[PDB]
Amino acid sequence: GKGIKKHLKRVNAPSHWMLNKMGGQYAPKTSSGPHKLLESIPLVILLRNRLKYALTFDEVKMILIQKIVKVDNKVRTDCTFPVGLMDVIHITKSNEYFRLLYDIKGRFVPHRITNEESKYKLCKVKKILLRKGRLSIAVTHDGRSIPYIHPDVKVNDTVRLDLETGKVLEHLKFQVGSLVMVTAGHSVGRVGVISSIDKNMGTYDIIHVKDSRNKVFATRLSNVFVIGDNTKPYISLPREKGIKLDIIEERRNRLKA
Amino acid sequence: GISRDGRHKLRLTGGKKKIHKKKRKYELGRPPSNTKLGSRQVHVVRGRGRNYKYRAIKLDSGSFSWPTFGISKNTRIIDVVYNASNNELVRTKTLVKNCIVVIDSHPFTTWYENTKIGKSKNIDPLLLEQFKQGRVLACISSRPGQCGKADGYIIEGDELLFYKRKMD
Amino acid sequence: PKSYRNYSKTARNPKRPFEKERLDQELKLIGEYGLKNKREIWRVQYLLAKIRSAARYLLTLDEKSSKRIFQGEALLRRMVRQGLLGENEEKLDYVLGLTLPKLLERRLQTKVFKLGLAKSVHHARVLIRQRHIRVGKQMVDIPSFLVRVDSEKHIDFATTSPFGGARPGRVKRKSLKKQKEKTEA
RNA sequence: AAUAGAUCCGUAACUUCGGGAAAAGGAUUGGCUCUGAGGACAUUAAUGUUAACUCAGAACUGAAACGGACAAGGGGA
RNA sequence: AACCUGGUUGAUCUUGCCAGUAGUCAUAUGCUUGUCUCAAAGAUUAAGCCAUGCAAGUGAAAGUAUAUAUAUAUAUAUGUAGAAACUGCGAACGGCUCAUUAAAACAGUUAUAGUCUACUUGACAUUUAUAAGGAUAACUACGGAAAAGCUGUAGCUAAUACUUGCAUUAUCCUUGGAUAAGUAUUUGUUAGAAGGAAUUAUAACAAAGAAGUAACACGUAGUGUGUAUCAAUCGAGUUUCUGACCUAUCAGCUUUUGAUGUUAGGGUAUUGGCCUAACAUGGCUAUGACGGGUAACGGGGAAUUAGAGUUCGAUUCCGGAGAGGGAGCCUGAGAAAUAGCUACCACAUCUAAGGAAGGCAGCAGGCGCGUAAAUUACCCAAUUCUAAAGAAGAGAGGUAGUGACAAGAAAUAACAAUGCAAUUGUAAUUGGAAUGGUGGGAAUUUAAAACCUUCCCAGAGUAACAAUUGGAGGGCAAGUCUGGUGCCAGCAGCCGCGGUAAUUCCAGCUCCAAUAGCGUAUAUUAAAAUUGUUGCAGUUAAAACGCUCGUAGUUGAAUUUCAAAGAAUCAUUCUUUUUAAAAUCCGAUUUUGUUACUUUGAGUAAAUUAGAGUGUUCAAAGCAAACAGUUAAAGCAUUGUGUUUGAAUACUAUAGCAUGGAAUAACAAAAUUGAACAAGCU
RNA sequence: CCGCCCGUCGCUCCUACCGAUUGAAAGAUAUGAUGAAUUGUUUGGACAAGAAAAAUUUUUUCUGGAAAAACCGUAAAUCCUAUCUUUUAAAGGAAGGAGAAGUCGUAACAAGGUUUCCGUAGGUGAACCUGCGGAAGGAUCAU
Ligand SMILES: [Mg+2]
Ligand SMILES: [Mg+2]
Ligand SMILES: [Mg+2]
Ligand SMILES: [Mg+2]
Ligand SMILES: [Mg+2]
Ligand SMILES: [Mg+2]
Ligand SMILES: [Mg+2]
Ligand SMILES: [Mg+2]
Ligand SMILES: [Mg+2]
Ligand SMILES: [Mg+2]
Ligand SMILES: [Mg+2]
Ligand SMILES: [Mg+2]
Ligand SMILES: [Mg+2]
Ligand SMILES: [Mg+2]
Ligand SMILES: [Mg+2]
Ligand SMILES: [Mg+2]
Ligand SMILES: [Mg+2]
Ligand SMILES: [Mg+2]
Ligand SMILES: [Mg+2]
Ligand SMILES: [Mg+2]
Ligand SMILES: [Mg+2]
Ligand SMILES: [Mg+2]
Ligand SMILES: [Mg+2]
Ligand SMILES: [Mg+2]
């Protein structure tokens, strides 16, 4: 037959899920939705491996049957729904809120935000389309269509989105001085500002980022996410604030009793 | 059946390939449609994602334009007179994309009883001698074996001189 | 499919089966530390060779290099924690001077013999195999256990042993039985 | 007795390298309706007149027949 | 651990091989076997043939029940459950094997501005109505056939099956008419926020035009099912550059019948000689074409090695291909599907002889083949998948049975006294402690299956609870000890031994080596600097063409901006300053050929490898864990609440993307001539 | 040196070669002949629903539609020729290696009793002998 594949083997799952290499030949095989397989995590993994609320797959099922878990303000019952980067999670029974972020390694964490912060998220623009009647639509990393976008929004900046109503609050530009978070190889939770942009014609654009300890790293354009203006960020950050020490001084710190 | 793969051709060096794969059904080649002049006949065939295309088997009329003015009118097809691939398709009167046909010109002459801003175009004589007898020469511009229709435009200018010289 | 658990060897053969001097030296060591085969000597040699290889590779590398600093500090800490270096010779060049008697002195057998507590090294091996010895409230019965620095002051008899305050063994109890029925009738 | 005209394919051992060779072998062939190729001359590339015979393709057709009578090698070790 | 010994001679020094030596996630076999942990297993030969059983199904608010059963309230109403059957979704994933395949497949790196895409996610629509149609399952009666997952005729009746079809607004300039009266898609004529680049989004004019916007279900202001376009997601088809083993006793191939291009069409989801007509004579090759061989599926990887290298990869993951051998086809978003269909070749089943059924390279199991490989067991508890998606199912998967493939730990005694040659030691004698192996019963573990761990009872003296496999001339550790045989029997990888004195045969005793393991056979790596780039030899040991010319290849003299003067360090290492020119900010910043080559980045799957942390009782391992407490303190939120964690880093061609550059090499620019500029002249 | 050693011929054993027999067998490829099944288009028209006054119907039908044929395609299979690869039988002929105390001579090693050896061409039971040109690895580094 040779159609679409449905199974996933354990040693072939993305390494940032951190799955035991014993105990099984399979992995949960996330569903199709707003996020790609490799840049996301299924709801079962979040709710069993990380938060330790469930001890098996069936317990995740009996948790999700009673409709108490909301992602982006809507109840979900799919055990393999993709949960993605800037997404807020609410557990009504325990009255808890979370936002997924990267740590300074490449692994996702739930950040435990408060109630006031739980009313918005940040979306980055992937493309802008012109449709019938000359109305504009924005496409975000979140797989989301926004009609009636502002004329001053470009195809790489970020916007702040209300969750009760799908309306836009404000937007942040993609400039030389903007604050950024990086989302791919060799530097995945690093926060720095921006130093320069390159714009090679037929190939990728390279940009440089300077840390708050005056360390400089570079990456591709397509793995850059703007998260604030020059002064301050627009969301809370995990404990380390995106500051990656090297192995020598990290080890030195860990030995401070 | 008919396949579109290149595994059975020779290499550019002249050597021959060894085949270790069967035909895969995503390179079908289903047989040609030899559309003919006659009363309307259209069949249905489905593509991959259940996308339908319409096979014409017989047509005798279509939509034709007058490119000088930008106006389109329905009319009847009388006869085919020239094919540039081979003349075995003028032989049996088959309709393909680049055929030359003769059509009824009464709708175009009648419509000219409104003379949209091109009121000073000075229609060339050859078109007038064609209009006098009631028939003109046109060129098909659709693909009848895919859309199920036959459309075209009126031939004029050096276009006309070329095709008139080719036919004598 | 095949299991994903792996395994490795721990010894090696001498490549020259009938050399006189090597054979006499091995018998020296076996009789001094009370061992069973040549395999024990060969496994200690294997471990020492791995250590020395790592030390040589690091020593070739540039002074004040990052890799040198990280891996050298790790290796020196491991060696000093095992009880092999000391205090005034942690310099990555005293690692290359480590001999076989150094490592072979840290076995639980040698330690139990040297800390009084047993009349002979063979007596020491026999007692370990009969569940009489603890290393910090955990009972251990393996003579190749290598004792770390912070654990050499907690070697003692076990609480479940007749030599450490418990009921006597199957022989004392039978003698006491027989004596009881002898003296009550 | 069987073969045989012509067109298109394909031809071994051996050899004095010239042959053997039409080696051996395989396919086609009527009639009818069409398409294409090959010259000369005079008004200026554009128009006009004007021949002879061969060759190559396509559709249709018949009680599967067509070098239709005449004419005309049997082959090999 | 960057290693060598025996054998040509009367004796010597060499070349040179033969034999010795060690490893193998490398197979078979012989002898032997007490405990625990871990776990390969019909690939090689026959992609040979298969009895029997199983391996894919699905209804817990939400399509259709007078088959029926039942509950209350009261002939009536609201309910609940429900063998059949229609309808929907899935069976194209998973599992198995390695026959074919040598620029093919595959790997790194690109393109789709040349395309298709179900389920899921976000946006969101246009030319009788208090509710329309007819027909069919299940079911009933009458049947046929030896037989099959066969079915005839007649009579009813449903649907989210199959059909038909109603009712509202946006713009032109606090009026009014015009009208848009058309989603995708095709044709003709034009205008024109983004990308390096548009015949791009998009807008207008004139013709065609699919399919749709709820005559549906639940009772939670909410959902479920279905629906036109766009976008996202899970994927695929094609596609750029570079990269493979042996063979020249394979040198010229391809092109009448598509070989290499141009033009016009056909066809496909789209590009394309993919196909058809006309035209032209092209395309590849000693830098190896076209052929032959492979006991060849390609990678991630494995073995052995100081550094170079040599040899393997059927087999955990990824990609490809196939279901006895070929070809064809239906349904469907997805198949050229084989526990789907149709034929032919081979093989084979039942039969009343008229006919009907078949595909274990899925799990067990059988025959055959051979040197060569396990139970016709238990379970959905874990990992996951399918469904009308808690609740059902799954030989996927897990658990146990067989199992000296391979890997880790580790028993077969210890002590004291007395004697005894030298504090020893022990061919000895005495005598009390300590322990598992073993039998029984429990606490646990597990789908109240069995291991393992932990307790209680019994229980070692010739501790009969009794260790083996190969050897003893040399290489090579270990006997000039006894008896037998007598060039026989036999041994011996090699040199050799064997006629009465056999250190070598056959035995007894004693010693040596490794040891729950030790020999033998075949293949392969080091040893082998005996294949040599690092790194061999060519007078006489094997080996300079009879001599010269000569194309491809390999390799090629010197020269162009050399310096000079201060600062930072116990001459050294670093670091500043400008010195020719032209273009460029009212006496100034910054630019000055192309590659090779070298530096630094980006991007990359795990497993395996290197390596950081962590007392599985140690180790092989694993990826976890640590802390206070006979049940509270302490902290942080106002009665509530355990706390701190780790799962790093490197590596990932030789080719591709970006980047600093002064040395070394190559190229471009260089005359029987070539410029740059004032000025008039178009 | 009473040393060493060479070649025919006779006997036994093992391996490979040439070979009449238009020898034999198993596969692969190409051309031809015949051709099952089937996509597409056309022809066909068992009958199922239709428009007609009459009483359930006469010939008129826009439709739907099975069996069955034809043609262009996709093409299993069988046969006849033609090469090619691998394996294999055989009268007879003629090599090599090993063995046994065989028969005949004495070619080489000393100036081996005619110094040995190279290329070529004749001849003879055998090793070998002779012509023509060459070498010293000679029995001469020298008149
Ligand atoms: Mg297949
Ligand atoms: Mg579960
Ligand atoms: Mg002849
Ligand atoms: Mg297998
Ligand atoms: Mg094989
Ligand atoms: Mg599969
Ligand atoms: Mg052609
Ligand atoms: Mg493989
Ligand atoms: Mg596979
Ligand atoms: Mg089979
Ligand atoms: Mg098939
Ligand atoms: Mg079959
Ligand atoms: Mg099967
Ligand atoms: Mg089986
Ligand atoms: Mg075996
Ligand atoms: Mg389950
Ligand atoms: Mg439900
Ligand atoms: Mg003996
Ligand atoms: Mg070797
Ligand atoms: Mg070598
Ligand atoms: Mg070497
Ligand atoms: Mg040599
Ligand atoms: Mg010479
Ligand atoms: Mg002589």
Side-chain angles (χ1 to χ4, degrees), chain B residues 54-112:
Chain B
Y54 300 94
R55 286 270 194 279
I57 301 194
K58 268 160 166 316
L59 293 166
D60 67 39
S61 80
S63 171
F64 285 81
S65 285
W66 193 348
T68 297
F69 294 92
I71 192 67
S72 296
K73 286 289 171 201
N74 274 94
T75 190
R76 177 176 76 248
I77 310 168
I78 308 307
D79 188 19
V80 301
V81 285
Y82 188 86
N83 184 287
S85 284
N86 71 334
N87 48 13
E88 295 296 329
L89 282 71
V90 302
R91 181 73 275 171
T92 58
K93 291 180 199 318
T94 44
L95 301 154
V96 300
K97 163 144 184 303
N98 219 11
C99 278
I100 304 300
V101 296
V102 54
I103 51 154
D104 187 13
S105 67
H106 286 305
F108 292 99
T109 68
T110 289
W111 169 86
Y112 199 77

Side-chain angles (χ1 to χ4, degrees), chain A residues 157-170:
Chain A
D157 54 5
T158 178
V159 65
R160 182 159 153 271
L161 189 84
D162 189 288
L163 280 186
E164 291 144 323
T165 65
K167 263 62 194 165
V168 173
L169 297 182
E170 65 183 1

Side-chain angles (χ1 to χ4, degrees), chain A residues 20-147:
Chain A
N20 187 24
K21 94 176 165 78
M22 307 292 185
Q25 311 265 327
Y26 293 113
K29 178 51 178 189
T30 177
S31 300
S32 43
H35 299 288
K36 291 181 181 178
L37 192 141
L38 281 71
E39 311 179 24
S40 169
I41 192 166
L43 190 54
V44 55
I45 293 286
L46 176 65
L47 195 60
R48 163 186 68 181
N49 300 62
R50 298 299 153 246
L51 278 298
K52 301 286 175 66
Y53 278 131
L55 293 176
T56 53
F57 205 109
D58 287 336
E59 293 179 353
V60 186
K61 185 65 194 287
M62 328 181 306
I63 283 172
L64 284 179
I65 281 297
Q66 41 189 350
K67 301 176 287 295
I68 54 188
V69 182
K70 308 197 177 195
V71 308
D72 279 332
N73 217 32
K74 296 161 166 203
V75 302
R76 305 278 183 211
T77 48
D78 191 359
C79 283
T80 51
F81 189 74
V83 181
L85 180 42
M86 294 296 172
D87 301 349
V88 305
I89 305 154
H90 176 29
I91 303 186
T92 67
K93 182 64 70 178
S94 292
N95 209 61
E96 276 183 343
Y97 301 85
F98 296 113
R99 201 198 290 279
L100 292 176
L101 278 297
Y102 283 118
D103 67 357
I104 51 162
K105 273 89 174 188
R107 57 180 86 103
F108 273 115
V109 287
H111 176 43
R112 212 181 273 276
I113 67 188
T114 60
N115 161 270
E116 294 294 328
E117 187 149 298
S118 158
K119 284 157 168 42
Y120 69 85
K121 64 177 290 187
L122 301 166
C123 310
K124 92 166 287 187
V125 170
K126 299 298 276 290
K127 72 176 75 175
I128 284 157
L129 303 172
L130 189 55
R131 282 291 154 262
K132 298 292 183 182
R134 284 201 37 111
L135 68 92
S136 295
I137 295 184
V139 173
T140 74
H141 81 286
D142 211 17
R144 194 191 282 256
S145 290
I146 315 293

Side-chain angles (χ1 to χ4, degrees), chain A residues 174 194-201 203-209 216-224:
Chain A
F174 176 86
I194 290 171
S195 286
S196 42
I197 312 173
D198 267 4
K199 295 177 69 54
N200 317 282
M201 293 177 71
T203 175
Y204 319 94
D205 291 6
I206 304 307
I207 76 168
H208 303 280
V209 187
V216 192
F217 48 104
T219 187
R220 295 216 217 276
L221 183 150
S222 82
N223 47 16
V224 160

Side-chain angles (χ1 to χ4, degrees), chain B residues 4 9 11 13 24 48 53 55 63 85 143:
Chain B
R4 307 178 289 117
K9 300 276 295 205
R11 295 194 221 256
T13 77
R24 289 286 154 171
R48 272 185 73 86
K53 44 174 83 168
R55 286 270 194 279
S63 171
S85 284
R143 301 187 74 193

Side-chain angles (χ1 to χ4, degrees), chain C residues 54-72:
Chain C
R56 287 189 52 205
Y57 161 69
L58 280 178
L59 269 167
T60 71
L61 200 65
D62 188 358
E63 182 68 23
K64 74 161 48 193
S65 165
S66 299
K67 193 174 291 285
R68 176 157 177 173
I69 286 157
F70 190 67
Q71 197 177 331

Side-chain angles (χ1 to χ4, degrees), chain C residues 107-124:
Chain C
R107 297 163 47 99
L108 178 62
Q109 199 187 340
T110 304
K111 203 66 72 173
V112 162
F113 165 55
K114 293 285 184 64
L115 265 47
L117 186 64
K119 289 203 165 184
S120 176
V121 73
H122 305 261
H123 190 223

